[PDB]
Write a protein that binds this DNA or RNA. Structure first.
Length: 358
RNA sequence: UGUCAAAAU
């Protein structure tokens, strides 16, 4: 069998819907754009829009379409962009066609992929951001294309309700993370700070709603990302710590999901905010006794122990002395209630750590 | 002793 056989029999669909036939088409498809067999196969692919869009939706057919994307020049890409734009929203939600869309985002010329990105502006973006398939399309656009192709997403997520729904979703939290990273990893090389204004418009909702976001089963991760980020998002980290966590550390160390946020905050914060957090913990049966004997706050106590142990090895010796004070206070309270703590592993681990350091 | 943590052959 050869390709002239499938061109003469008009059987492109019948091999591309088969596994072995599509692998034959992929292995023998000519890569040079001026080959006649290349052009005849391309015409048979794109001459009927319904056939093309059904081949994009196929379990085995899509791959051949993806190979046609890898070999394509600008004239072929214009036709492909028009056919994809006619059904882009359902193509993004499909298990097979979304991979064609993602490869198109990587491989098309930037104005063509910009056109496809801006086609989605008036669709249902929450539904697209929370789908198992379309989330990856949104992330591919954000991490691939320049920002002017997707600032409508920053405007969309500037609304508070939209942010909460996407951030609290299993998949949309990943979308929020990728957008914050892309807008923060850059702006450093920029001279006019265009991306950090967009990042401030995005992070205003996060700081405005971060108590509910930190208490959530999926949005907590997003709240941990900012705090764990570093100097790129350090201002927003410090805003979250001074506004949300302070005067609420006793409550959220006891919650199932927000205790991870409190733990990450003890792990990654400046000394002033750490000192204010230790002030809140040691100055409310008081708060440290509650957190030693709690199913979630015990891990917060362990994190305080670890950030005092690694904290003592510091250049400024005043901060190191305060770290020693805090660790000595924790050590004294644990040796006061060691008898009961030994009953549960919650305490065995805490003691083992306090034993490691004498 | 604590989290549902990302879609094809």
């Amino acid at each position: 069998v050869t390709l002239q056989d499938v061109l003469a029999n008009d059987a492109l669909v019948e091999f591309a819907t088969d596994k072995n036939g599509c692998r034959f088409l992929q292995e023998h498809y000519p890569t040079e754009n001026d080959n006649d067999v290349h052009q005849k196969l391309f015409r048979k692919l794109v001459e009927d829009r319904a056939i093309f869009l059904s081949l994009c939706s196929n379990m085995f057919g899509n791959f051949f379409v993806q190979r046609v994307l890898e070999c394509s020049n600008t004239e072929e890409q214009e036709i492909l962009t028009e056919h994809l734009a006619t059904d882009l929203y359902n193509l993004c939600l499909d298990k097979s066609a979304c991979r064609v869309i993602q490869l198109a985002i990587q491989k098309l010329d930037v104005h063509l992929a910009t056109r496809l990105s801006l086609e989605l502006r008036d669709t249902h973006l929450v539904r697209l951001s929370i789908d198992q398939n379309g989330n990856h399309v949104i992330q591919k656009i954000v991490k691939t294309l320049p920002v002017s192709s997707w600032t409508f997403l920053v405007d969309f997520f500037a609304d508070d309700d939209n942010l909460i729904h996407v951030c609290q979703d299993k998949y949309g939290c990943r979308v929020i993370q990728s957008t914050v990273e892309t807008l923060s990893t850059d702006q450093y090389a920029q001279c006019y700070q265009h991306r950090v204004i967009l990042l401030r418009s995005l992070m205003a909702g996060v700081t405005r709603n971060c108590t509910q976001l930190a208490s959530n089963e999926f949005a907590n991760y997003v709240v941990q990302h900012v705090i764990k980020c570093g100097d790129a998002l350090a201002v927003y980290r410090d805003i979250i710590i001074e506004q949300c966590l302070l005067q609420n550390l006793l409550s959220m160390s006891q919650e199932k999901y927000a205790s991870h946020v409190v733990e990450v905050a003890f792990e990654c914060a400046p000394y002033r905010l750490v000192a204010e957090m230790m002030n809140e913990i040691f100055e409310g049966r008081d708060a440290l006794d509650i957190l030693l004997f709690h199913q979630y706050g015990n891990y917060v106590v362990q994190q305080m122990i670890q950030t005092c142990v690694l904290g003592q090895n510091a250049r400024d010796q005043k901060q190191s002395e305060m770290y020693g004070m805090w660790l000595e206070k924790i050590h004294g309270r644990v040796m006061r209630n060691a008898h009961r703590l030994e009953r549960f592993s919650s305490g065995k681990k805490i003691i083992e750590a306090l034993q490691s350091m004498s």
